[PDB]
Amino acid sequence: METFTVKMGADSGLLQFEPANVTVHPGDTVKWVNNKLPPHNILFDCKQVPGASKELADKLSHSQLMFSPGESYEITFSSDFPAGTYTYYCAPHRGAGMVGKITVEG
Ligand SMILES: *[C@@H]1CC(=O)N(C)C1=O
Ligand SMILES: [Cu+2]
């Protein structure tokens, strides 16, 4: 049971999440922190999550924009969640390919 931290906007000043791709075990915590070049948000698409479950995507996505620095959003992948690859993106910076992927390992 750990806690992974992802910065919304690279310290370099690029429009990415870092680390972009992550690998976690069930029970772990993911914490996005507002870093460089806000505003950001976190969206999963209908058919990017395991099973393409719309309700799932909408349960995880923080559709609301975050503006102040240090502002954070947390998801804990308890046993409740299925395994596979969850793919997410910042909506304002979709064009610039601000994209990340979390894989749930076994
Ligand atoms: C993406 C998946 C879907 O069916 N809708 C309505 C989306 O926004
Ligand atoms: Cu962004």
Swiss-Prot record:
GO CC field: plasma membrane-derived thylakoid membrane
Residues annotated to bind Cu cation: 40, 90, 93, 98
Domain called Plastocyanin-like: residue spans: 2-106
Keyword Membrane applies: yes
Protein's job: Participates in electron transfer between P700 and the cytochrome b6-f complex in photosystem I.
UniProt keyword Phosphoprotein present: no
Cofactor(s) for this UniProt protein: Cu(2+)
Molecular function GO terms recorded: copper ion binding; electron transfer activity
Compartments (UniProt record): Cellular thylakoid membrane
Principal subcellular localisation of the protein: membrane
Membrane topology label: Peripheral membrane protein
Similarity comment text for this entry: Belongs to the plastocyanin family.
Domain of life: Bacteria
Name of this chain's protein: Plastocyanin
Keyword line: Copper, Electron transport, Membrane, Metal-binding, Signal, Thylakoid, Transport
